[PDB]
Design an enzyme around this catalytic site. Structure first.
Site, mmCIF file in Angstrom:
data_model
loop_
_atom_site.group_PDB
_atom_site.id
_atom_site.type_symbol
_atom_site.label_atom_id
_atom_site.label_comp_id
_atom_site.label_asym_id
_atom_site.label_seq_id
_atom_site.Cartn_x
_atom_site.Cartn_y
_atom_site.Cartn_z
ATOM 1 N N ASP C 23 0.826 -1.199 0.000
ATOM 2 C CA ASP C 23 0.000 0.000 0.000
ATOM 3 C C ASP C 23 0.865 1.256 0.000
ATOM 4 O O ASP C 23 1.689 1.460 0.898
ATOM 5 C CB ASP C 23 -0.925 -0.004 1.214
ATOM 6 C CG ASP C 23 -2.301 0.545 0.902
ATOM 7 O OD1 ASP C 23 -2.705 0.502 -0.276
ATOM 8 O OD2 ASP C 23 -2.978 1.021 1.837
ATOM 9 N N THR C 56 -3.817 5.139 -4.322
ATOM 10 C CA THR C 56 -2.975 6.070 -3.586
ATOM 11 C C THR C 56 -1.551 6.150 -4.119
ATOM 12 O O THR C 56 -0.826 7.080 -3.757
ATOM 13 C CB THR C 56 -2.933 5.688 -2.105
ATOM 14 O OG1 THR C 56 -2.403 4.366 -1.967
ATOM 15 C CG2 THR C 56 -4.325 5.726 -1.513
ATOM 16 N N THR C 57 -1.129 5.202 -4.954
ATOM 17 C CA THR C 57 0.199 5.230 -5.561
ATOM 18 C C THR C 57 0.194 5.805 -6.972
ATOM 19 O O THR C 57 1.165 6.458 -7.380
ATOM 20 C CB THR C 57 0.802 3.822 -5.579
ATOM 21 O OG1 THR C 57 2.045 3.840 -6.289
ATOM 22 C CG2 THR C 57 -0.139 2.836 -6.235
ATOM 23 N N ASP C 354 -9.438 -2.062 1.501
ATOM 24 C CA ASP C 354 -9.480 -1.487 0.158
ATOM 25 C C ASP C 354 -10.723 -1.947 -0.599
ATOM 26 O O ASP C 354 -11.401 -1.144 -1.257
ATOM 27 C CB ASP C 354 -8.215 -1.861 -0.614
ATOM 28 C CG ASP C 354 -7.048 -0.951 -0.297
ATOM 29 O OD1 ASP C 354 -7.071 -0.290 0.761
ATOM 30 O OD2 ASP C 354 -6.098 -0.901 -1.107
HETATM 31 N N1 LIG Z 1 -5.802 -7.456 -14.344
HETATM 32 C C1 LIG Z 1 -5.305 -6.240 -14.667
HETATM 33 N N2 LIG Z 1 -4.976 -5.941 -15.941
HETATM 34 C C2 LIG Z 1 -4.481 -4.739 -16.280
HETATM 35 N N3 LIG Z 1 -4.275 -3.746 -15.400
HETATM 36 C C3 LIG Z 1 -4.562 -3.909 -14.088
HETATM 37 C C4 LIG Z 1 -5.104 -5.195 -13.640
HETATM 38 N N4 LIG Z 1 -5.294 -5.089 -12.314
HETATM 39 C C5 LIG Z 1 -4.907 -3.842 -11.944
HETATM 40 N N5 LIG Z 1 -4.466 -3.142 -13.002
HETATM 41 C C6 LIG Z 1 -3.967 -1.745 -12.986
HETATM 42 O O1 LIG Z 1 -2.953 -1.537 -12.002
HETATM 43 C C7 LIG Z 1 -3.001 -0.167 -11.597
HETATM 44 C C8 LIG Z 1 -2.468 0.023 -10.181
HETATM 45 O O2 LIG Z 1 -3.313 -0.585 -9.211
HETATM 46 P P1 LIG Z 1 -2.676 -1.125 -7.837
HETATM 47 O O3 LIG Z 1 -1.303 -1.642 -8.179
HETATM 48 O O4 LIG Z 1 -3.688 -2.036 -7.188
HETATM 49 O O5 LIG Z 1 -2.495 0.163 -6.888
HETATM 50 P P2 LIG Z 1 -3.479 1.433 -6.942
HETATM 51 O O6 LIG Z 1 -4.828 0.825 -7.226
HETATM 52 O O7 LIG Z 1 -3.348 2.017 -5.558
HETATM 53 O O8 LIG Z 1 -2.927 2.311 -8.034
HETATM 54 C C9 LIG Z 1 -4.444 0.274 -11.763
HETATM 55 O O9 LIG Z 1 -4.481 1.528 -12.446
HETATM 56 C C10 LIG Z 1 -5.086 -0.791 -12.626
HETATM 57 O O10 LIG Z 1 -5.634 -0.204 -13.806
HETATM 58 MG MG LIG Z 2 -5.425 -0.559 -5.996
#
Ligand SMILES: Nc1ncnc2c1ncn2[C@@H]1O[C@H](COP(=O)(O)OP(=O)(O)O)[C@@H](O)[C@H]1O
Ligand SMILES: [Mg+2]
Ligand SMILES: Nc1ncnc2c1ncn2[C@@H]1O[C@H](COP(=O)(O)OP(=O)(O)O)[C@@H](O)[C@H]1O
Ligand SMILES: Nc1ncnc2c1ncn2[C@@H]1O[C@H](COP(=O)(O)OP(=O)(O)O)[C@@H](O)[C@H]1O
Ligand SMILES: [Mg+2]
Ligand SMILES: [Mg+2]
Ligand SMILES: [Mg+2]
Lengths: 526, 201, 487, 479, 50
Positions: C23, C56-57, C354
């Site tokens: 996170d 948040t990132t 979350d």
């Molecule tokens: N199965 C997936 N395929 C493609 N992109 C994904 C998938 N799951 C999550 N993402 C992308 O990863 C990005 C970062 O999400 P995450 O790493 O959970 O942290 P945060 O949601 O806090 O940015 C999101 O913008 C999302 O669009």
């Molecule tokens: Mg996320």
């Protein structure tokens, strides 16, 4: 590093390569420290404390060593927590899980060296564990419908558990004690209902399990010292200054004679309470609190043995042993049940007098007397007996067993290899690494014995490949034998927990690529 | 939130205060309520720190025990029978009082700051009472809707709809403490200028 | 730490405690920095977490990219106020474009499939992805059970998240009742009741005591004996009062005496001792009963019905816990988390939080867009298209915003192990050629770029919050031109 | 031994020496536990057990260098231990408790190695009488040594140690004037002779001047009533237990008791009430209503004596209801001598207790050890493999005790051990080292014997400790 | 001193935050405070004019 500073003085950061190096080094060091204590021919370690006034212990259990070792590497703390949780959950297998985790991380290090992303290794290990747990479940043998076979399995499990400990010098003697003590509970998993009393003097072969019950307490003066056909009342009440009327009251008079009269009424109240207690028709009274000298003399005149200051644990164990109930307010003799036993007396063990109950009614609790030549020996004996009691209780709660001596590990390794030969991509290398990590525990066992581990493991692997799903190591000679014939048995829950915990810890450590440390809190010297 | 999410409420709104067990068992939205503003402490306590009780018999002891509950329940019933649906106090509201109010579908709040209570009184049209022995209608405030809402991780009490209001409240959003502090500093400059311009044009 | 293939950080506390987490808000909170700009980024992440609860990132990544892009314009001789104005214009254009491509779906207890898909997408990046289907189902069920629909809000004090180390992670479950860390007072009480009627109390099982200073004077033996009789009469009277209402179980916030304990055991009525205020109010809300302050006020209309009350025992320890289950329609539920490691429990708690926050956002507003960078690519295309009609030297700032808005596909592709420039060039060419704004980065390598087909869903308010908050923080950072500090 | 604080001890007891040192090596912190275990189990032989354990651990080194495995060494040691138990039990000899000469010989043998060997002719019969006064030989299976109390009193010489078949108290009498009573009736009190006091908060309020005198009059009458009630039963000696919350004996009460000619003794400890009741037959009283003539004890003499300069001492002798208790008064011209004599008497008592526990006797002077070594050397040849080497090492590690005895006596150890082995290998198995003759001779003719339990316990505990030590292969430092 | 930061564009606030100890310089802080208290706007212009 950037020319601008983004941290306080003393704060530290480690990035990809250094972080992986540090974590792998810490984990491998932790595994290598405890490898030596594995198997029927493992050895002991001496733990002495610099701070706690030079306390000394000699031990073999893995969790005990890891709790006392003062690690500071962040990676090692995860393994220590995993071992402690394993001990808290099943109470056996605290060395195998950490050895497996260390070997998995050691394989992952070379896999990373071969330019493979950690997520690929993680997926491969996930599939490998999914196959291995299914193979292990399919390998289980379920008994319980047959009393004779169930008792034989319990004896085999206890004898296999006690092999690696010092009590291996008297394995049959302690196996019988463990089995009987576990079966005295009539199916209840109450482990604290068994009281272990350890005292110096005599050889370790003089330990025994009492047929009745033993208390280390005393009885009041001018009271009978032994009773036949006892009727026991177990109470939890206040027979000291008993007139704690919790109101905020006081006494105000205009004379000393009135104070004398009130003081007399004070004793009259206690006399009435003692008469109410005696109205139940008893000849033995056991209280968890203190009994003062005036009620003491009342009981002595009435001809009743009174036990004072037997704490919560003792009261509950006495209730389970005799069958009475913990009573208070003593106002309904027809609604309170009394205990019963055929003899109460006093015995001399070493230089100590103990109250001995014989001919008890229920027997739902027991005490075990341990004799030894050294305090460290007694501590290790109790610590070893705890593992046997815990594993016996667990296998009674869930009665399906799996063969040991490496057979389970080779079965899981064969399943993982068969899965690996069926898949494309880089994940096949990860599953083969998982199989290699699984096939290391028999190697360490044989190495600790002093045998040709490579040749023995090759023979075992060939036999399992051809279809001998019960072959294993024979340690008394150092050969390949049949585990079902030799009686090497284990519980299924322990192996399942070992596998799953090792996989979880390995994945958790492997997902890390950055270590951030904050400025430590300075100790105050003066 | 974003800056465009800043708002002005013609009425009053203030942060949630400390609450005891039972606060979650009472309703959180009213349409045409009556509001009681108090400076009285509603909980079981000693009458005066100067007091002392000397008694001789257990019957009188029991009567003395019952008297305190009778006093507290008398105050609570005096509050209840006036028709008020929202109760606000500067002094602590006990758990007994909270459960009493929750069992009759009424809202209670304690330890409300003095400035917020004065602003609420000015917005609604009541008066702070130190005694519940003369709770007439003319001392009860009235609002056209009362709610409790979630705002950015916090819980806020909103009194809106009063047309005779002589006050208002700003809710400012932003991304940082200094962001909001600079926003407030910027708002102050406009407020003073507008006041002076109202004085002379 | 961005994307389903991202890695996580290990943070060591001031006292030597270890936290393994993914996170961004927690990482930035646990880092200690001196730079005021770094503290500003930490506060930006915390504000995003407080408002929305997810993403948040991405916001800090976007802010860093935007500030980096402003540097060339600064070097070329552009006043930073002009850059800030151009950033504002581009952000407004992008936000106006964002709601045009969003699709609304649903909120109801009957279907729940889009909610499950959204929760799966939000849980796809965490260590819980081994059982993410199960945990997404748990989260959506809990939020739908607790939510208030006419006012469109939820209360997170009605959801209790507890975890005990041991067992397997898959043992995590949802209880439509209450679970507390207590047990029955007397060791010989029954360990289960199947038609429990609960009397919830806030008064100790002791003779009464006035709060004001008091003194009871004893002047005679008759007064002594009267007090002696009164003490036990009170103890009997309270138990008969409790029994007369037909209750079968009693719960109290304070302690009992030995006499009360034995009387409760003797009258065949188990009791629970020393519970907390939040637990009492949760129990009352779940069982439909009411909290009573005195025994005199206890009536059969104030009891609560519970279909099962049990005591659960864990492994070789003495730890025991109490579970209240099988009530009628309840507004309180609990999540019981299990795992082999303490850090596993902590990370599971954070992931569940979350998921609950995302489902709450869906309750608040029910129109979504598609992830994998598709929204960012479409917004960049829209900003670049609009910038071609601005002659007043702000086209440079608008194109800088468009360039900085494409850092998310770079991060995703680089984490996944493919080539960023070629990948996003091909994706943008496909998007402009066809008319599908739902094309993104194939991170998991399933063979398609269609996130609508792959079921990757994100809330609209999350993207709006990210864009607006990052733009305003960048404006604040750019506005500053001086600094003073001690040595 | 001089401690860190500054205290000084002079001792020959092995367990005491090991406890008083501060050994630091972890392997050396188990020998003190072994000595304590032998002290608990037998009360004698605390030195020979440590010598044997050290000898076995020393002998292990050659086998380890040769290449034997520690597990094989442990198993062979266990085999040798079983054979040794067999040999010693064969060598033992039955004994009956009605034979006073055997007990005298055993006590004097256990006692002729300490500083008080010159006073053995006075201390041995005291020990035998003390043990025989507490048990019933018909069915006694163990001896409670807490039934015998040792009192240390400075002054005089060891020659002045004595046995008391009665009660001895170290504290003084509070009654000024009375110091000797014949035909004494004794009572024990667990309540306070003072002003009335309730356990609740009580207080008296005065609002008129008459009450001021009334309070004093009532208190005086209240005390006088209790004194008269005590006098009614014919009691002559009163004992009062310690009380810390309220005054247990006031000046007015003491004045009345003195006027009634009753000797008062105060501050009886709360933990020797059981011993006092067991000795003099009294019964504790905690309520004045129960103070009756049947709750008293009868004694022939109860008086206090004044030693030359050391102080006073209360003696009660000639009890009509004699319990199974006894006490010993130990004298001496120095504290070091007094403690050493006390330890020696404890050793003698423990030896007699062991002889009661096991009715078996054996010869001393190294005979059991030399016979064990010879028999195990013969036994080793029958085995094949590393077992023969290990058993022969175990056999050879038993000449250390006879060698040490010869070296201490100042003879030639090699010649002495050779002659002992040769004589044991051609017949008599009671030959041993004669320090008076200065050679080798029959050891029963010197009337030196010992219980079998001492040797058996020493051998078993030493073997178990060695087997435990062989199991360790790592030392780590913890927090 | 305590590490707390303040970001400001207000002349009076900036002048207060500066730790001015020059007797002649303190007058320019005083007039800024007076202007802020009296009209509430124009704190920089008066200092520049002086
Ligand atoms: N199965 C997936 N395929 C493609 N992109 C994904 C998938 N799951 C999550 N993402 C992308 O990863 C990005 C970062 O999400 P995450 O790493 O959970 O942290 P945060 O949601 O806090 O940015 C999101 O913008 C999302 O669009
Ligand atoms: Mg996320
Ligand atoms: N007699 C035996 N023969 C072969 N293998 C054994 C025997 N006893 C135990 N094992 C093996 O020893 C391992 C257990 O290691 P051990 O040190 O005893 O327990 P822990 O898991 O606590 O370390 C298991 O692989 C078990 O099968
Ligand atoms: N008069 C004696 N002549 C020869 N050997 C004796 C004599 N008295 C005692 N011994 C022997 O000396 C040893 C006694 O040593 P001692 O100091 O008592 O050691 P410990 O306290 O260990 O028993 C025993 O072997 C005992 O048989
Ligand atoms: Mg084990
Ligand atoms: Mg001796
Ligand atoms: Mg201005």
């Amino acid at each position: 590093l950037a020319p601008v500073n983004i941290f306080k003085a003393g704060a530290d950061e480690e990035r990809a390569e250094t972080a992986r190096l540090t974590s792998f080094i810490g984990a491998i060091a932790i595994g290598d420290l405890v490898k030596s204590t594995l198997g029927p021919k493992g050895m002991d370690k001496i733990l002495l404390s610099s701070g706690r006034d030079a306390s000394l212990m000699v031990t073999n259990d893995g969790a005990t060593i890891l709790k006392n070792i003062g690690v500071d590497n962040p990676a090692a703390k995860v393994l220590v927590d995993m071992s402690r949780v394993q001990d808290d959950e099943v109470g056996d297998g605290t060395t195998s899980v950490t050895v497996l985790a260390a070997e998995l991380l050691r394989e992952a290090e070379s896999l990373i060296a071969k330019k493979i992303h950690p997520q690929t290794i993680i997926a491969g290990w996930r599939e490998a564990t999914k196959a291995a747990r299914e193979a292990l479940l399919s390998s289980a043998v379920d008994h319980g419908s047959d009393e004779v076979k169930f008792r034989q399995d319990l004896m085999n499990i206890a004898g296999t558990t006690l092999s690696s400990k010092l009590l291996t010098h008297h394995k049959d003697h302690f196996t019988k004690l463990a089995v009987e003590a576990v079966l005295r509970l009539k199916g209840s998993g109450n482990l604290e209902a068994i009281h272990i009393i350890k005292k110096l003097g005599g050889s370790l072969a003089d330990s025994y399990l009492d047929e009745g019950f033993l208390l280390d307490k005393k009885i009041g003066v001018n009271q009978p010292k032994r009773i036949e056909n006892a009727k026991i009342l177990i109470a939890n009440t206040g027979m000291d200054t008993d007139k704690i009327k919790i109101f905020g009251s006081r006494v105000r008079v205009d004379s000393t004679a009135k104070v004398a009269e009130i003081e007399h009424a004070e004793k009259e109240k206690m006399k009435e309470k003692v008469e109410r207690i005696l109205k139940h028709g008893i000849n033995c009274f056991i209280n968890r609190q203190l009994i003062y000298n005036y009620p003491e003399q009342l009981f002595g005149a009435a001809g009743v043995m009174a036990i004072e200051h037997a704490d919560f644990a003792g009261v509950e164990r006495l209730a389970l042993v005799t069958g009475g109930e913990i009573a208070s307010t003593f106002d309904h003799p027809e609604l309170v049940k009394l205990g019963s036993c055929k003899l109460i007396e006093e015995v001399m063990i070493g230089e100590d007098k103990l109250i001995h109950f014989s001919g008890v009614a229920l027997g739902e609790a027991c005490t075990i007397v341990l004799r030894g030549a050294t305090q460290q020996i007694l501590d290790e004996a109790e610590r070893s007996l705890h593992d046997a009691l815990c594993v016996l209780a667990q296998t009674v709660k869930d009665s399906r067993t799996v063969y040991g001596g490496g057979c389970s590990e080779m079965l899981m390794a064969h399943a993982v290899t068969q899965l690996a030969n069926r898949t494309p991509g880089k994940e096949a290398v990860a599953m083969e690494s998982y199989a290699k990590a699984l096939r290391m525990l028999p190697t360490i066992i044989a190495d600790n014995a002093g045998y040709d581990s490579a040749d023995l493991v090759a023979q075992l692997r060939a036999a399992h490949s051809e279809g001998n799903t019960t072959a294993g190591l024979d340690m008394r000679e150092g050969t390949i034998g049949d585990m079902a014939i030799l009686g090497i048995t284990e519980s299924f829950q322990v192996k399942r927990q070992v596998l799953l915990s090792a996989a979880e810890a390995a994945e958790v450590i492997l997902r890390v690529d950055n270590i951030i440390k904050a400025a430590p809190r300075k100790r105050v010297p003066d | 939130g974003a800056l465009e999410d800043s708002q002005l409420v013609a009425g009053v709104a203030f942060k949630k205060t400390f609450s005891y067990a039972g606060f979650e068992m009472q309703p959180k939205k009213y349409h045409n309520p009556k509001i009681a503003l108090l400076n009285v402490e509603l909980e079981l306590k000693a009458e005066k720190d100067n007091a002392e009780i000397r008694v001789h018999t257990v019957e009188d002891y029991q009567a003395i025990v019952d008297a305190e509950w009778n006093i507290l329940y008398d105050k609570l019933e005096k509050i209840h029978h006036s028709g008020a649906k929202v109760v606000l106090s500067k002094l602590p509201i006990g758990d007994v009082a909270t459960q009493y109010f929750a069992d009759r579908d009424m809202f209670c709040a304690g330890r409300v700051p003095e400035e917020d209570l004065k602003r609420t009184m000015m917005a609604c049209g009541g008066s702070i009472q130190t005694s519940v022995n003369a709770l007439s209608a003319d001392v009860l405030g009235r609002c056209q809707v009362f709610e409790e809402t979630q705002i950015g991780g916090e819980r806020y009490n909103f009194f809106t709809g009063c047309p005779k209001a002589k006050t208002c409240t700003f809710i400012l959003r932003g991304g940082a403490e200094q962001f909001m502090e600079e926003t407030e500093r910027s708002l102050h400059d406009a407020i003073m200028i507008v006041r002076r311009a109202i004085k002379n044009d | 730490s961005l994307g389903p293939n991202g890695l996580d950080k290990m943070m060591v506390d001031k006292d030597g405690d270890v936290t393994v987490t993914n996170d961004g808000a927690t990482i930035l909170s646990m880092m200690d920095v001196d730079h005021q700009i770094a503290k500003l980024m930490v506060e930006l992440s915390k504000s995003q977490d407080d408002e929305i609860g997810d993403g948040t990132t991405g916001v800090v990544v976007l802010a860093g990219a935007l500030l980096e892009e402003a540097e060339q314009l600064l070097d070329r001789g552009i006043h930073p106020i002009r850059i800030a104005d151009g950033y504002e214009q581009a952000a407004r254009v992008a936000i106006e474009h964002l709601d045009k491509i969003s699709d609304s779906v649903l909120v109801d207890i009957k279907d729940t499939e889009p909610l499950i898909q959204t929760a799966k997408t939000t849980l796809g990046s965490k260590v819980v992805n081994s059982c993410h289907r199960q945990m997404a189902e748990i989260a959506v069920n809990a939020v739908l059970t607790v939510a208030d629909m006419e006012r469109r809000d939820v209360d997170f004090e009605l959801i209790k998240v507890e975890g005990k180390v041991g067992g397997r992670l898959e043992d995590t479950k949802l209880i439509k009742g209450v679970i507390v860390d207590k047990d029955f007072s007397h060791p010989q009480m029954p360990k289960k009741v199947e038609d429990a009627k609960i009397a919830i109390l806030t008064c100790p099982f002791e003779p009464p005591k006035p709060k004001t200073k008091h003194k009871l004077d004893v002047t005679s033996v008759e007064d002594y004996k009267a007090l002696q009789k009164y003490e036990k009469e009170k103890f009997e009277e309270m138990i008969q009062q409790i029994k007369e209402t037909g209750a079968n179980l009693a719960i109290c916030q304070w302690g009992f005496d030995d006499e009360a304990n034995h009387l409760l055991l003797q009258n065949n009525l188990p009791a629970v001792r020393w519970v907390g205020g939040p637990e009492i109010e949760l129990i009352a809300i779940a069982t439909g009963g009411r909290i009573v302050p005195r025994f005199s006020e206890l009536t059969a209309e104030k009891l609560g019905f519970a279909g099962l009350v049990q005591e659960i025992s864990f492994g070789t320890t003495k730890d025991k816990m109490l579970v209240i289950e099988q009530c009628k329609n309840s507004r309180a539920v609990t999540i019981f988390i299990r795992g082999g490691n303490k850090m596993i429990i902590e990370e599971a708690k954070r992931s569940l939080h979350d998921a609950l926050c995302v489902i709450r956002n869906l309750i608040r507003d029910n129109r979504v867009v598609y992830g994998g960078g598709a929204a960012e690519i479409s917004c960049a295309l829209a900003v670049s298209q609009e910038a071609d009609k601005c002659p007043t030297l702000e086209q440079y700032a608008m194109r800088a915003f468009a360039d900085a808005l494409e850092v998310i596909p770079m991060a995703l592709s680089e984490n996944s192990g493919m080539n960023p420039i070629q990948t996003m060039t091909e994706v943008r060419a496909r998007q402009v050629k066809e008319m599908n704004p739902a094309l993104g980065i194939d991170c998991l390598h399933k063979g398609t770029n269609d996130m609508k087909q792959q079921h990757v869903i994100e809330t609209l308010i999350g993207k709006k919050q990210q864009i607006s908050l990052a733009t305003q923080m960048v404006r604040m950072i750019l506005k500053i031109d001086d600094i003073r500090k001690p040595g | 031994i001089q401690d860190g604080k500054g205290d000084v001890t002079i001792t020959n007891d092995g367990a005491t020496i090991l406890k008083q040192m501060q050994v630091l090596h972890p392997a050396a912190r188990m020998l003190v536990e072994l000595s304590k275990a032998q002290d608990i189990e037998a009360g004698d032989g605390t030195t020979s057990v440590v010598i044997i354990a050290g000898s076995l651990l020393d002998s292990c080194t050659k086998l380890l260098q040769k290449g034997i495995h520690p597990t094989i060494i442990s198993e062979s040691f266990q085999k040798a231990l079983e054979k040794g138990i067999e040999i010693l039990t064969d060598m033992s000899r039955p004994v009956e408790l009605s034979d006073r000469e055997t007990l005298l010989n055993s006590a004097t043998t256990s006692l002729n190695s300490k500083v008080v060997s010159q006073y053995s002719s006075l201390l041995s019969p005291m020990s035998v009488n003390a043990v025989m006064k507490v048990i019933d030989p018909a069915t006694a299976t163990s001896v409670d040594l807490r039934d015998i109390k040792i009192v240390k009193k400075l002054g005089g010489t060891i020659d002045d140690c004595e046995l008391v078949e009665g009660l001895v108290l170290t504290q003084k009498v509070s009654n000024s004037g009375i110091t000797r009573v014949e035909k004494a009736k004794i009572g024990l009190i667990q309540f306070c002779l003072s002003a009335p006091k309730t356990d609740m908060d009580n207080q008296i309020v005065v609002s008129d001047y008459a009450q001021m005198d009334r309070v004093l009059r009532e208190e005086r009458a209240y005390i006088l009533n209790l004194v008269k009630q005590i006098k009614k039963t014919g009691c002559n000696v009163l004992l009062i237990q310690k009380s810390i919350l309220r005054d247990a004996l006031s000046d007015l009460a003491l004045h009345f008791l003195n006027k009634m000619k009753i000797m008062v003794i105060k501050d009886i400890e709360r933990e020797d009430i059981e011993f006092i009741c067991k000795t003099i037959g009294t019964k504790p009283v905690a309520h004045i209503d129960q103070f009756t003539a049947d709750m008293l004890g009868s004694a022939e003499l109860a008086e206090e004596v004044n030693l030359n300069g050391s102080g006073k001492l209360l003696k009660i002798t000639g009890c009509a209801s004699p319990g199974k208790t006894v006490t010993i008064v130990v004298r001496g011209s120095n504290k070091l001598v007094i403690e050493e004599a006390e330890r020696s008497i404890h050793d003698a008592l423990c030896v007699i207790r062991c002889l009661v526990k096991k009715r078996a006797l054996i010869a001393g002077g190294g005979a059991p050890e030399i016979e064990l070594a010879l028999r195990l050397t013969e036994y080793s040849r029958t085995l094949s493999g590393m077992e023969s080497y290990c058993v022969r090492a175990f056999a050879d590690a038993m000449e250390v005790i006879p060698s040490t005895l010869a070296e201490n006596a100042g003879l030639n150890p090699i010649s002495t051990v050779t002659e002992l082995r040769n004589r044991h290998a051609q017949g008599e198995k009671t030959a041993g080292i004669n320090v008076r003759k200065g050679g080798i001779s029959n050891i029963l003719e010197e009337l030196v014997v010992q219980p079998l339990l001492v040797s058996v316990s020493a051998l078993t505990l030493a073997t178990e400790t060695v087997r435990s030590i062989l199991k360790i292969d790592d030392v780590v430092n913890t927090r | 001193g305590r590490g707390k930061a303040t970001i400001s564009n207000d002349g009076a606030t900036i002048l207060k935050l500066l730790d001015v100890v020059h007797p002649a310089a303190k007058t320019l802080v005083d007039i800024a405070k007076s202007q802020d208290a009296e009209v509430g706007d124009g704190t920089t212009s008066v200092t520049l004019l002086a």
